[PDB]
Ligand binder design. Structure first.
Ligand SMILES: Nc1ncnc2c1ncn2[C@@H]1O[C@H](COP(=O)(O)OP(=O)(O)OP(O)(O)=S)[C@@H](O)[C@H]1O
Ligand SMILES: [Ca+2]
Ligand SMILES: [Ca+2]
Length: 174
């Protein structure tokens, strides 16, 4: 169930109601442990819930954790490193894909370190429409606070040395 280094995997995101949200066709595995999966992708096909497709324009390093309710996408744009963080179930991985539930809230981090919590409106609507249990609401709000602290502390994928190591490792394997 732990992906191997050099493996190309699919990533499948779902909503709480079981519907597919988004699928990324190809991510190369850089690190696979029981707790952490790091991958890189570049010009991967992306499929939306209506089947519509688009191809990513730039490389990304992706960070998944088995014990935290978020995952982190690290983007290399012309004026520096952008992060897009999903609030989410932790991941599971099987032969089909690395899989998680998308829980609406998102955090964007700019090259200057500024972060913004996005999609409180999306979250409120979906939590009512799909009847998220109280304990999911508590865990997600706890994990928003944990993720803001990781960003402020430059912990995990927010460490500049993390970016140096994995961006170079992906450039070599690709
Ligand atoms: N797994 C991924 N691999 C590569 N790029 C990704 C990945 N996930 C997100 N991105 C990039 O991160 C940015 C935001 O991701 P989106 O696909 O917009 O996700 P999202 O923010 O969860 O959207 P909503 O709120 O569900 S419509 C875009 O630049 C994406 O290309
Ligand atoms: Ca999201
Ligand atoms: Ca969202």
């Amino acid at each position: 169930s732990i992906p191997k280094e050099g493996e190309n995997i699919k990533i499948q995101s779902y909503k709480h109601d079981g519907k597919i949200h988004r699928v990324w066709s190809e991510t190369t595995i850089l690190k696979g442990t029981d707790h952490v999966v790091i991958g890189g992708n570049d010009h991967t096909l992306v499929t939306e819930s209506d089947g519509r497709t688009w191809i990513t324009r730039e490389p990304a390093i992706v960070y998944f954790h088995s014990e935290y309710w978020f995952n982190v996408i690290c983007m290399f744009r012309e004026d520096g490193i952008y992060y897009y963080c999903n609030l989410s179930s932790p991941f599971v991985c099987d032969e089909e894909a690395l899989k998680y539930i998308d829980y609406d809230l998102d955090i964007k981090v700019y090259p200057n370190g500024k972060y913004h919590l996005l999609d409180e409106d999306e979250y409120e609507q979906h939590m009512n429409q799909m009847n998220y249990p109280h304990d999911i609401d508590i865990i997600l709000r706890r994990n928003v606070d944990i993720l803001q602290q990781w960003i402020e502390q430059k912990k995990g994928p927010f460490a500049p040395d993390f970016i140096k190591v994995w961006k170079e490792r992906y450039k070599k394997i690709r």
